[PDB]
Amino acid sequence: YSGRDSLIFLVDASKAMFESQSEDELTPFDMSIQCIQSVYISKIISSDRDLLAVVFYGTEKDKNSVNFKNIYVLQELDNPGAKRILELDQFKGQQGQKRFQDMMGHGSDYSLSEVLWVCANLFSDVQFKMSHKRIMLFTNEDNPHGNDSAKASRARTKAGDLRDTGIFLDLMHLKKPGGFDISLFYRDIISLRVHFEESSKLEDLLRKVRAKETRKRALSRLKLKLNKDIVISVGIYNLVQKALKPPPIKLYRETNEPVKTKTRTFNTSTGGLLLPSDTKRSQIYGSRQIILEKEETEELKRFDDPGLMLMGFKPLVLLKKHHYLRPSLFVYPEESLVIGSSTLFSALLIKCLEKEVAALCRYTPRRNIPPYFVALVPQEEELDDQKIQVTPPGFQLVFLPFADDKRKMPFTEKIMATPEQVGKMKAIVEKLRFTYRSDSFENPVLQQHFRNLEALALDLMEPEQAVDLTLPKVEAMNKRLGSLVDEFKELVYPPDYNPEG
């Protein structure tokens, strides 16, 4: 696949970024600092597996192996850590910029070619499977080296060199009272409005993002058989996985090192250490308990080899949609072991969509596991406005209950109500209709777990408030309806019966 990712961030040392046209507004230096801390913590929450670095230039001091002047690296390409967050945090604020100007140089001339060279060098200094390129920059000046046209020439030459070596750059607008005026030196050396302002994609960086976004990984490599010998390469995925809190990392009291776990069984009467062979599975049914060993217990659990065998075809309407047992799975055709299976997949999906019939198929996920009966639900490929898929093509995996899985229900009868009341809450729902969207409902409880986690990690002054969305805005609905609720209470309920006991 695509392995680790690298994101590199560049900010010039000059007094322009320490100053603003309006002192109420942030300095470019300070807003860049707070934005980079925000994206660092967002990445730590989201996809901490990748690699990040911090480097500065234009200072009165330099830190790099190449010893290019005023070129000062701060954090090399590493997975982000809380120490990095705090050591970039103290430099925020007015006092932060003051102490930065004190202990760190600020404001000098340099070359873009040399900073490009050293950043490419430190990118090369990583021995990990690289996935993508992201070398951010932050400047309010579009012509930093137009004084020497040779410097511009070598800068665009080195930009061509990076784009030849599979490196990709990106530019961030910074506020300019005279307008940043892109295309003066860019859109040709890099890969619209003059942008007096700066917010072009920083607003997407400032918003808090909390997820895990598991990368592209096959759930299981599976081989499908129709009757006895039709071999098909199929790949199973899931569009949804239950998100859980990360496991606690058990560790020592004082030193807080992670203590290893030792588990053992020993005799009581003898007192000596037991052995794994002596362990026997035991259950007590009736008077005579049952003596057993584990290996034959999973052998009894072992029924059939993994595979999907077609058990027939049933129209999609015959199944009752309320029958679910698990988050639905999704299969995709494969051509790894079997060649031409995708042609079969296309033909069968076309024919089944024409005939709107499900495909019942016995399911065996893993060896020595009980088999199961699943029906194949076809799914089309739906594009968005920009022709980007929103509904993936392929087949959904629905799970049908057994006889025992259907819990018995207490007897319930059919009771009718006046159609006047029916129209009444038809009006009620029409008052409060909206459209569901899947990208607006998170688990704020996990969000608060994380919130407390960075609050303790970075010693944040307050436990960050979880912006819950599960609570209804009851006042709004009550305002919208008002005198209709008591109308329902009089229409249906007797005017002496409280809903409580």
Partner: peptide
């Protein structure tokens, strides 16, 4: 690329959770 996570290559951009907007 527009419509993709600028913070995450190979992933789409996600709009912040909004909740509800009744009609």
């Amino acid at each position: 690329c527009p419509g993709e996570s600028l913070i995450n290559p190979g992933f789409k951009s996600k709009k912040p959770a909004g909740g509800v907007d009744f009609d």
